[PDB]
Design a binder for these strands. Structure first.
Ligand code: AMP
Length: 529
RNA sequence: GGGGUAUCGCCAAGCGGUAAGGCACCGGAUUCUGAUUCCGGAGGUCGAGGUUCGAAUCCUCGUACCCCAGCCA
């Protein structure tokens, strides 16, 4: 429960409603992100819990900011998240003829007029946050003049900027949006749905309430910036022949630490190529979180956990992470990899290797076990071996043992380095029978696995507030480590996510893992205190 | 000017009855993942009043922060 669900209950009880019908209206001007996941869960979830319906409407009243590529994707992630919309996919453009008819009703009703003030002029006549606005000189044309002038616009008689249809409200209203907000503006551009049928397009406020009304939306849910805008939402409906009046309710938008949500900023990262695509694993997009290896179920859990309120908030990464962890920790099977390898060599070992039985999930034996190749020329991660240091350091020391993963307790007893004092091999002796702890991969059967380590895209918690958010990117957001993993991973499949023991949770894909180079994405590392 | 919001570190409940819940942090128990799991702790109701037996919840004066001056959504 949250404040919106309480309002829904009150109405259901008060008989104000007999069903709930919500909607998710993204403008197809970019890809969906974690913020849209919060909105998708709210709207689609509410509907399903309340045995109602929820529509997917692409608010496409601005041909110049949107592309078909986006509608294609939006649909994809909405589904991938586990949500189904009611009936066909909608579009504001479907109501483009209804809206025109409504603009004409307002006009006939004397509530709208073709203004001819330039764009700089409408701003000048607009007033300020404290000083009131002033009436346009064209404010009082006749219904005949307005009808005539509107069609003129529609026909293409007027140049872009040369004219716009305005609502005749109150130029001194403390609500700046009520200062004769524009209803229709001229754009000689092609629409991705209506082609070049319309040379005039409707503004958001005009289109939103009407679409909502036509679809029969009971509760229009949106973010807080549209609180003032609600005044125009109710005015439009109140002033036209429409049989329903959907009610708007605003909730705070999600803000995530070390990342940016603005489609404009996200777009920029994508435009300027500072990230691969909208699906780059460091992007907070849905396709991004997906390619990174997040589970729709973990996102829905995230959104569920963060709550819905009217308070500006900024969730820490830690929370998002806890979510994929709590999922993957229980469903992912363990594996063995070495991101930064250093060849160990048990001179004490004789043979061409053998095989050791390993589990698929330590606390879940019913997930089965497996056979893995052992040898005297195995690899380990550098950080595991230490020539010296502390009484807490539970790994390999230049004079002690350690239990290799699911295998033998080796015991270092030498080493060797190169011209730059960098080790190359570590000579140790395996206890004939033993089967701190560490993880390995035999060199003989070591698949050359490219491992991709991801980190926070930005170096500052609130990059958005930075003067140049781009200049504050994290150069180590993606560190590509070539490594070695067990031959098991020879049979990985994009979609499947395993937990490389002791490291993190990894998954294939990343748009790169060919048959030769199995590239892997590190979804999230483990709690490492 | 107008619209909103103020509960530990971050989120966020109890809506007149006396500080949930998640995440973060800090300790202890197990674990061939320093993980998991498991107990234990630290910290909070903007300020100043009023009402009340009692207020986080109602009333008020402050103050702080956010949004609004796109022919963007
Ligand atoms: N950062 C965000 N947090 C929460 N909801 C968001 C966020 N960004 C967009 N939305 C929701 O997604 C809808 C469609 O967004 P557009 O594509 O701008 C909005 O009307 C909001 O309900």
């Amino acid at each position: 429960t949250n404040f919106i669900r309480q309002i829904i209950d009150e109405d259901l009880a008060s008989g104000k409603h007999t069903t709930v019908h919500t909607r998710f209206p993204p403008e197809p001007n970019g890809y969906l992100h974690i913020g849209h996941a919060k909105s998708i869960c709210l709207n689609f979830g509410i509907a399903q819990d309340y045995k109602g319906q929820c529509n997917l409407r692409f608010d496409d009243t601005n041909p110049v900011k949107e592309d078909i590529e986006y509608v294609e994707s939006i649909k994809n992630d909405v589904e991938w998240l586990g949500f189904h919309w009611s009936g066909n996919v909608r579009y504001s453009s479907d109501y483009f003829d209804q809206l025109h008819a409504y603009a004409i009703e307002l006009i006939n009703k004397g509530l709208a007029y073709v203004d001819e003030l330039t764009p700089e002029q409408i701003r000048e006549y607009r007033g300020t946050l404290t000083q009131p606005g002033k009436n346009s000189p064209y404010r009082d044309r006749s219904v005949e003049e307005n009808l005539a002038l509107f069609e003129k616009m529609r026909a293409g008689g007027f140049e872009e900027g040369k004219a716009c249809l305005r609502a005749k409200i109150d130029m001194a209203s403390p609500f700046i949006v009520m200062r004769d907000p524009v209803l229709y503006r001229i754009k000689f551009a092609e629409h991705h749905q209506t082609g070049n049928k319309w040379c005039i397009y409707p503004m958001y406020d005009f289109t939103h309430c009407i679409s909502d009304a036509l679809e029969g939306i009971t509760h229009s849910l949106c973010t807080l910036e549209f609180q003032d805008n609600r005044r125009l939402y109710d005015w439009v409906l109140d002033n036209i022949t429409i049989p329903v009046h959907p009610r708007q309710y605003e909730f705070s938008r999600l803000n995530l630490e070390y990342t940016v949500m603005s489609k404009r900023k996200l777009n920029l990262l994508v435009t300027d190529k500072h990230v691969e695509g909208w699906d780059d694993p460091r992007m907070p997009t849905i396709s991004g979180l997906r390619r990174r290896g997040y589970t729709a179920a973990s996102i829905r859990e995230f959104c569920k956990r963060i709550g819905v309120t009217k308070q500006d908030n900024t969730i820490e990464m830690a929370s998002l992470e806890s979510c994929i962890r709590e999922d993957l920790n229980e469903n992912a099977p363990r594996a063995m990899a070495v991101i930064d390898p250093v060849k160990l060599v048990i001179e004490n070992y004789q043979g061409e290797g053998e095989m050791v039985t390993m589990p698929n999930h330590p606390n879940k034996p019913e997930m089965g076990s497996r056979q893995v190749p052992f040898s005297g020329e195995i690899w380990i991660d550098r950080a595991d071996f230490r020539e010296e240091a502390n009484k807490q350091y539970k790994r390999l020391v230049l004079g002690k043992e350690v239990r290799l993963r699911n295998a033998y307790v080796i015991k270092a007893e030498r080493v060797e380095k190169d011209a730059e004092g960098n080790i190359t091999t570590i000579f140790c002796t395996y206890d004939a029978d033993t089967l701190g702890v560490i993880h390995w991969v035999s060199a003989a059967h070591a698949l050359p696995v490219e491992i991709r380590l991801y980190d926070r895209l930005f170096s500052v918690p609130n990059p958005g507030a930075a003067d140049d958010f781009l200049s504050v990117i994290n150069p180590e957001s993606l560190v590509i480590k070539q490594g070695f993993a067990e031959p098991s991973l020879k049979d990985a499949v994009a979609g499947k996510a395993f937990q490389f023991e002791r490291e993190g949770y990894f998954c294939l894909d990343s748009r790169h893992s060919t048959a030769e180079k199995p590239v892997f994405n590190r979804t999230v590392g483990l709690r490492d205190t």
